[PDB]
């Protein structure tokens, strides 16, 4: 399959070179897999999700995404036009309030929730969790991410946007999960992207067009935007039977575009998420 005039990020993950505009992908498109987006919620009614999205848990007064961040991330995972895995099932877990903030205890509860809830869902091809959030180092937050991964869920987390070593941030600094940095359309490390030895992979993160609340779209930037590219790619690859939840991060790193990025500090991987699609 081919999507012409695709968002640059989608094009990039299906090419060995920057500057292309077509997203090439297998028509299976992540069908049979499930992705939990742990964020501000998802506007499930957005036409772009085609009824494949639903809220399963909120830690606040409503399950509604009053912010937009969660909807945007979910869109990059699996919306029709803006998504990597266009036929995946999306589950929303609202651990962040409508200002985009949340307490660590709530974020942890949300992760524990997903580890259990997946046992109630029909996801034959596997389960992924996308965490476009974080803050200062916390061993308890790291532990929760480690538990989720251990339970058999592919966990992808944002490196953070402090232009600093991600070792001082959580859940980014948990080694067992898949920590995702951001790049721009010219194959430079995004100016805000965290770096360091704990990073596993880079994905498109600067000027990413996706779904927004009120049935709209917008372009925003962050490691928050790179994370769902990797989460979507994982779901896509698991559906193809190429990898499992336990080894997806390693498989993505192994099959990545290598050495393409500039402005990568010594000690940080030079690896960009790549689907290796060949018609």
């Amino acid at each position: 399959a081919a999507q012409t005039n695709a968002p640059w990020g989608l094009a990039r993950i299906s090419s060995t070179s920057p500057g292309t505009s077509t997203y090439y992908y297998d028509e299976s498109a992540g069908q049979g897999s499930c992705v939990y987006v742990i964020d501000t919620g998802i506007e499930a009614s957005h036409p772009e999700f085609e009824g494949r999205a639903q809220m399963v848990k909120t830690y606040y007064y409503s399950s509604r995404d009053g912010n937009g961040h969660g909807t945007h991330c979910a869109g990059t995972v699996g919306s029709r036009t803006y998504g990597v895995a266009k036929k995946t099932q999306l589950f929303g877990v609202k651990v962040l309030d409508d200002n985009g903030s949340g307490q660590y205890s709530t974020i942890i509860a949300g992760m524990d929730f997903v580890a259990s809830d997946k046992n109630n869902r029909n996801c034959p091809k596997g389960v992924v969790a996308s965490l476009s959030l974080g803050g200062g180092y916390s061993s308890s937050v790291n532990s929760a991410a480690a538990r989720l991964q251990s339970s058999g869920v592919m966990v992808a987390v944002a490196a953070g946007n402090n232009n600093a070593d991600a070792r001082n941030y959580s859940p980014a600094s948990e080694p067992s999960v898949c920590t995702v940095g951001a790049s721009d359309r010219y194959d430079r490390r995004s100016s805000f992207s965290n770096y360091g030895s704990v990073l596993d992979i880079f994905g498109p993160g600067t000027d990413i067009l996706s779904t927004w609340i009120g049935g709209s779209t917008r372009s925003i930037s962050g490691t928050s935007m790179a994370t769902p590219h990797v989460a979507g790619l994982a779901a896509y690859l698991m559906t193809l039977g190429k990898t499992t939840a336990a080894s997806a991060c390693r498989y993505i790193a192994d099959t990545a575009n290598k050495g393409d990025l500039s402005n990568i500090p010594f000690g940080t991987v030079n690896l960009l998420a790549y689907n290796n699609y060949q018609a």
């Binding site: 476009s132 803050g135 944002a158 946007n161 951001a182």
Partner: peptide, 5 residues
Amino acid sequence: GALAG
């Protein structure tokens, strides 16, 4: 994360 997007 950190600032995380």
